[PDB]
Amino acid sequence: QKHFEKRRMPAANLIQAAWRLYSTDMSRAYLTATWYKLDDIMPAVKTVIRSIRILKFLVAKRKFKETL
């Protein structure tokens, strides 16, 4: 029990990072006139935000694996 409840915070962390990563490309947070314009004039900005979430997903995946 105590060893498999030590997995619960890094498991939650991995799900959250995965979901935040996935939401970069479908969330209502990006379905605004501002983001469509910002994504027209400066496409690199959204890609950078997504690159950062990938890096955080990778870190979170490694930490959850270190609790096995």
């Binding site: 939650a12 962390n13 690199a44 950078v48 890096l55």
Partner: protein
Amino acid sequence: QLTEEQIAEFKEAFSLFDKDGDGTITTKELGTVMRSLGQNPTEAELQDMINEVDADGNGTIDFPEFLTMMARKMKDTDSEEEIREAFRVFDKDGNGYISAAELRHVMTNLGEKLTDEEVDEMIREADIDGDGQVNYEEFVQMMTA
């Protein structure tokens, strides 16, 4: 598998980090862009992000490593397996389901907690049966697609 101009898009993102055109990203460049967006990583968190993809060991990300990372995203066998194992930590039934409510409780109370608006968007994206359960296998394959 990547088009020649889709590589030029990833290169545009990369150069936003590597503004001096040295062909590398250090904690300095990674952190400066993050903080320009209002994020505040620590130095240790930046070192871990970079160490995930630095295949050489000098503490940088170069463009070939960046491109591979952007191309794979979450679409890899190891990611699907490990996310599946995370969901199972919160599923003592083993049947492969978790209740919408328990998922909300875990998401908003553990780790880097989701906000009410975030978890509402996640539960909305996953279909729910007549009981309230969600198959996380279906959810894992939808995110690693």
